[PDB]
Protein backbone atom coordinates (compact mmCIF):
# COMPACT_ATOMS: atom_id res chain seq x y z
CA UNK A 1 0.00 0.00 0.00
CA UNK A 2 2.38 2.73 -1.23
CA UNK A 3 1.94 3.70 -4.89
CA UNK A 4 -0.30 2.10 -7.53
CA UNK A 5 -0.84 3.30 -11.11
CA UNK A 6 -4.06 2.90 -13.11
CA UNK A 7 -4.22 -0.07 -15.49
CA UNK A 8 -4.35 2.49 -18.33
CA UNK A 9 -1.96 5.45 -18.18
CA UNK A 10 -2.34 6.49 -21.84
CA UNK A 11 -5.13 6.18 -24.43
CA UNK A 12 -5.61 5.82 -28.20
CA UNK A 13 -6.06 9.09 -30.12
CA UNK A 14 -6.99 7.35 -33.39
CA UNK A 15 -10.62 6.16 -33.99
CA UNK A 16 -10.90 2.69 -35.54
CA UNK A 17 -13.46 -0.04 -36.33
CA UNK A 18 -14.49 -2.97 -34.02
CA UNK A 19 -13.43 -5.15 -36.98
CA UNK A 20 -10.02 -5.23 -35.29
CA UNK A 21 -11.53 -5.76 -31.83
CA UNK A 22 -12.11 -9.36 -30.73
CA UNK A 23 -12.03 -9.00 -26.94
CA UNK A 24 -13.27 -6.14 -24.72
CA UNK A 25 -12.11 -5.36 -21.18
CA UNK A 26 -13.58 -2.82 -18.72
CA UNK A 27 -12.01 -2.17 -15.30
CA UNK A 28 -13.85 0.04 -12.79
CA UNK A 29 -12.03 2.23 -10.24
CA UNK A 30 -9.78 -0.14 -8.28
CA UNK A 31 -7.16 0.07 -5.52
CA UNK A 32 -4.92 1.38 -8.31
CA UNK A 33 -7.39 3.61 -10.16
CA UNK A 34 -10.08 5.90 -8.73
CA UNK A 35 -11.92 6.11 -12.07
CA UNK A 36 -13.00 3.92 -14.98
CA UNK A 37 -10.95 2.64 -17.93
CA UNK A 38 -12.15 0.71 -20.99
CA UNK A 39 -9.40 -1.65 -22.17
CA UNK A 40 -9.57 -3.68 -25.38
CA UNK A 41 -7.69 -6.48 -27.20
CA UNK A 42 -7.03 -6.71 -30.95
CA UNK A 43 -7.01 -10.06 -32.79
CA UNK A 44 -3.36 -9.37 -33.67
CA UNK A 45 -2.76 -10.25 -30.02
CA UNK A 46 -2.30 -6.63 -28.89
CA UNK A 47 -3.86 -4.63 -26.05
CA UNK A 48 -4.59 -0.89 -25.95
CA UNK A 49 -6.63 1.56 -23.85
CA UNK A 50 -9.52 3.78 -24.99
CA UNK A 51 -10.81 6.99 -23.40
CA UNK A 52 -14.63 6.94 -22.78
CA UNK A 53 -14.21 10.71 -22.97
CA UNK A 54 -14.29 10.46 -26.79
CA UNK A 55 -17.58 10.01 -28.66
CA UNK A 56 -16.04 7.73 -31.30
CA UNK A 57 -15.02 5.42 -28.46
CA UNK A 58 -18.58 5.04 -27.23
CA UNK A 59 -19.51 4.18 -30.82
CA UNK A 60 -16.88 1.66 -31.94
CA UNK A 61 -17.29 0.05 -28.52
CA UNK A 62 -21.09 0.11 -28.74
CA UNK A 63 -20.92 -1.69 -32.08
CA UNK A 64 -18.73 -4.42 -30.56
CA UNK A 65 -21.45 -5.13 -27.98
CA UNK A 66 -24.22 -5.05 -30.60
CA UNK A 67 -22.09 -7.33 -32.79
CA UNK A 68 -21.09 -9.83 -30.09
CA UNK A 69 -24.72 -9.89 -28.94
CA UNK A 70 -26.26 -10.40 -32.38
CA UNK A 71 -23.72 -13.14 -33.09
CA UNK B 1 -20.32 -5.65 9.44
CA UNK B 2 -22.28 -4.69 6.30
CA UNK B 3 -24.83 -7.26 5.05
CA UNK B 4 -24.65 -8.63 1.49
CA UNK B 5 -28.28 -8.35 0.31
CA UNK B 6 -28.11 -11.05 -2.40
CA UNK B 7 -25.30 -15.17 -4.69
CA UNK B 8 -21.74 -16.07 -5.97
CA UNK B 9 -20.72 -19.65 -6.99
CA UNK B 10 -21.64 -22.77 -4.98
CA UNK B 11 -19.66 -24.87 -7.55
CA UNK B 12 -16.38 -24.26 -9.43
CA UNK B 13 -15.52 -25.17 -13.03
CA UNK B 14 -15.49 -21.66 -14.58
CA UNK B 15 -11.86 -20.57 -15.13
CA UNK B 16 -11.34 -19.21 -18.71
CA UNK C 1 -5.88 -26.38 -35.72
CA UNK C 2 -7.50 -29.53 -34.30
CA UNK C 3 -9.83 -28.94 -31.34
CA UNK C 4 -10.49 -25.69 -29.44
CA UNK C 5 -13.02 -25.15 -26.64
CA UNK C 6 -14.86 -21.89 -25.91
CA UNK C 7 -13.39 -19.61 -23.19
CA UNK C 8 -16.46 -20.15 -21.01
CA UNK C 9 -16.25 -23.91 -20.38
CA UNK C 10 -19.71 -23.41 -18.82
CA UNK C 11 -21.93 -20.66 -17.38
CA UNK C 12 -23.72 -20.42 -13.99
CA UNK C 13 -27.43 -19.52 -13.78
CA UNK C 14 -27.37 -18.15 -10.17
CA UNK C 15 -28.56 -14.47 -10.23
CA UNK C 16 -25.35 -12.68 -9.14
CA UNK C 17 -25.02 -8.99 -8.15
CA UNK C 18 -22.88 -6.04 -9.40
CA UNK C 19 -21.58 -5.43 -5.82
CA UNK C 20 -19.08 -8.30 -6.32
CA UNK C 21 -17.95 -7.25 -9.87
CA UNK C 22 -14.86 -5.07 -10.34
CA UNK C 23 -13.73 -6.12 -13.83
CA UNK C 24 -15.80 -7.10 -16.88
CA UNK C 25 -14.63 -9.20 -19.84
CA UNK C 26 -16.45 -9.87 -23.13
CA UNK C 27 -15.04 -12.21 -25.80
CA UNK C 28 -16.74 -12.42 -29.20
CA UNK C 29 -16.79 -15.60 -31.30
CA UNK C 30 -13.13 -16.59 -31.76
CA UNK C 31 -11.13 -19.42 -33.35
CA UNK C 32 -12.23 -21.37 -30.27
CA UNK C 33 -15.83 -20.16 -29.96
CA UNK C 34 -18.37 -19.49 -32.72
CA UNK C 35 -20.58 -17.40 -30.41
CA UNK C 36 -20.34 -14.74 -27.71
CA UNK C 37 -19.47 -15.12 -24.01
CA UNK C 38 -19.64 -12.67 -21.09
CA UNK C 39 -16.93 -13.20 -18.45
CA UNK C 40 -16.42 -11.36 -15.14
CA UNK C 41 -13.80 -11.10 -12.37
CA UNK C 42 -15.34 -12.10 -9.02
CA UNK C 43 -14.19 -10.11 -5.93
CA UNK C 44 -13.67 -13.50 -4.15
CA UNK C 45 -10.49 -13.65 -6.27
CA UNK C 46 -11.25 -15.63 -9.44
CA UNK C 47 -13.14 -15.49 -12.78
CA UNK C 48 -16.80 -16.37 -13.52
CA UNK C 49 -18.80 -16.83 -16.79
CA UNK C 50 -22.35 -15.43 -17.33
CA UNK C 51 -24.97 -16.43 -19.91
CA UNK C 52 -26.39 -13.41 -21.86
CA UNK C 53 -29.36 -15.74 -22.32
CA UNK C 54 -30.59 -14.73 -18.84
CA UNK C 55 -32.36 -11.42 -18.25
CA UNK C 56 -30.78 -10.91 -14.81
CA UNK C 57 -27.40 -11.09 -16.54
CA UNK C 58 -28.22 -8.23 -18.88
CA UNK C 59 -29.24 -6.26 -15.79
CA UNK C 60 -26.43 -6.83 -13.28
CA UNK C 61 -24.04 -6.34 -16.20
CA UNK C 62 -25.86 -3.22 -17.40
CA UNK C 63 -25.53 -1.70 -13.94
CA UNK C 64 -21.77 -2.34 -13.95
CA UNK C 65 -21.45 -0.27 -17.14
CA UNK C 66 -23.70 2.49 -15.80
CA UNK C 67 -21.70 2.43 -12.56
CA UNK C 68 -18.22 2.39 -14.11
CA UNK C 69 -19.36 5.15 -16.47
CA UNK C 70 -20.89 7.40 -13.81
CA UNK C 71 -17.78 6.94 -11.67
Curated annotation (Swiss-Prot), chains A, C:
Outcome, altering residue 67 to A: Impairs heparin-binding activity and leukocyte transendothelial migration
Cysteine disulfide links: 6-33, 8-49
Source organism superkingdom: Eukaryota
Protein name: IL-8(7-77)
Residue window of the full protein shown: 29 to 99 of 99
Curated annotation (Swiss-Prot), chain B:
Localisation: Cell membrane
Source organism, top-level taxon: Eukaryota
Family listed: Belongs to the G-protein coupled receptor 1 family.
Subunit structure: Interacts with IL8. Interacts with GNAI2.
Known function: Receptor to interleukin-8, which is a powerful neutrophils chemotactic factor. Binding of IL-8 to the receptor causes activation of neutrophils. This response is mediated via a G-protein that activates a phosphatidylinositol-calcium second messenger system.
Stated name of the protein: C-X-C chemokine receptor type 1
Taxonomic source organism: Homo sapiens
Amino acid sequence: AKELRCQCIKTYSKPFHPKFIKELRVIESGPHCANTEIIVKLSDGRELCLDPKENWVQRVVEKFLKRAENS
Amino acid sequence: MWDFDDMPPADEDYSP
